[PDB]
Design a protein around this nucleic acid. Structure first.
Ligand code: MG
Ligand code: NA
Ligand code: NA
Length: 325
DNA sequence: CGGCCTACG
DNA sequence: CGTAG
DNA sequence: GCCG
């Protein structure tokens, strides 16, 4: 088992779901307390279990696995022996965890805002609604739409959204293309938002594209909220006899950068953090969603595909459905 | 012990 | 500060 | 919290 998540296939479904879920609760709780290091370790340990070929049945099977030390091993041991881990259950039922989870789920609210509200004594969404001047426009939209945004987006919803995005993109710039990214590109059947990447085969033609796309979607009445190359939107999606709000992200990249942007926006989040960590620490190359830089030659790698990027970094290629770290 | 991804709005 | 994978 |  290699130590970086980008060095191993991780499928969407696996053989250690309960164990990974428990470690991810502790990762989430670490993040609510501002402990990014502990968050990363628990995320990585969870991800190692997702990559195993069969269920962990005995504590012995953790020996040698990366990111399993005393703490993560104890969590697993308690789950194997008793079916529950006391620490995990204490987190789950804690007022702090539940409220921080509720507040940070709001579009426009991060850990720092949620924590301040928590320390002020706020606990529920209606608490927030009763003092609306205390909220940004973005937070107001996130609160108004919170119920719809909590409802899973289905793959059927995604196909409908992609056609309407393509129509606006085609008027904004004939020849521009729309690619589904994020979790749905990794094979998820549901999700909490839809991610699209837009480019044009003629380098430079994509300049100024996103405003033109946004104005066209808004003129079609489809945009419930929007605030450039990244747009974080709430879209009106038709439903039987009505509609629902859906989070949609639209990103533009020049075709020279498209493989990097595709790689970055396909995720998973942990996969990409691990890939960038691997690039820099193991290969001395600096990776982002725009390119891959050699800081000794002061040159950027040209890539025509995701396959090119994995080759550059000396990694076996993983298709999107094996990037579910 | 230092490090923990790296951007854009 | 928020957002994204 | 863990790795190197
Ligand atoms: Mg997504
Ligand atoms: Na949020
Ligand atoms: Na998104």
């Amino acid at each position: 088992m290699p130590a970086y998540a980008c060095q191993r296939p991780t499928p969407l479904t696996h053989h250690n779901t309960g164990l990974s879920e428990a470690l991810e609760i502790l990762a989430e709780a670490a993040g609510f307390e501002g402990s990014e290091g502990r968050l990363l370790t628990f995320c990585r340990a969870a991800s190692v279990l997702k990559a195993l070929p069969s269920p962990v049945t005995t504590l012995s099977q953790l020996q040698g696995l990366p990111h399993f030390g005393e703490h993560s091993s104890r969590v697993v041991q308690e789950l194997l022996e008793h079916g529950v881990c006391e620490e995990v259950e204490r987190v789950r039922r804690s007022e702090r965890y539940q409220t921080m989870k509720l507040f940070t789920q709001i579009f426009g609210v991060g850990v720092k805002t949620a924590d301040r509200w928590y320390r002020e004594g706020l606990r529920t969404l209606d608490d927030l609604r009763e003092q609306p001047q205390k909220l940004t426009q973005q937070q107001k939209a996130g609160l108004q739409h919170h119920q719809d945004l909590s409802t899973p987006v289905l793959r059927s919803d995604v196909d409908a959204l992609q056609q309407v995005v393509e129509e606006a993109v085609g008027q904004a710039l004939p020849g521009a293309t729309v690619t589904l990214t994020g979790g749905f590109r990794r094979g998820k059947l549901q999700g909490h938002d839809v991610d699209f990447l837009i480019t044009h085969p003629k380098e430079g033609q994509e300049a100024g594209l996103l405003p033109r796309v946004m104005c066209r979607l808004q003129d079609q009445g489809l945009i419930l909220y929007h605030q450039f190359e990244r747009s974080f939107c709430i879209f009106r999606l038709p439903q039987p006899g009505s509609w629902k709000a859906v989070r949609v992200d639209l990103v533009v990249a020049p075709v020279s950068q498209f493989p990097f942007a595709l790689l970055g926006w396909t995720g998973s989040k942990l996969f990409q953090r691990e890939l960038r960590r691997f690039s820099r620490k193991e290969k001395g190359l600096w990776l982002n969603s725009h390119g891959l830089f050699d800081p000794e030659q002061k040159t950027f790698f040209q890539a025509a595909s995701e396959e090119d990027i994995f080759r550059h970094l000396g990694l076996e290629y993983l298709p999107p459905e094996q990037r579910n770290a």
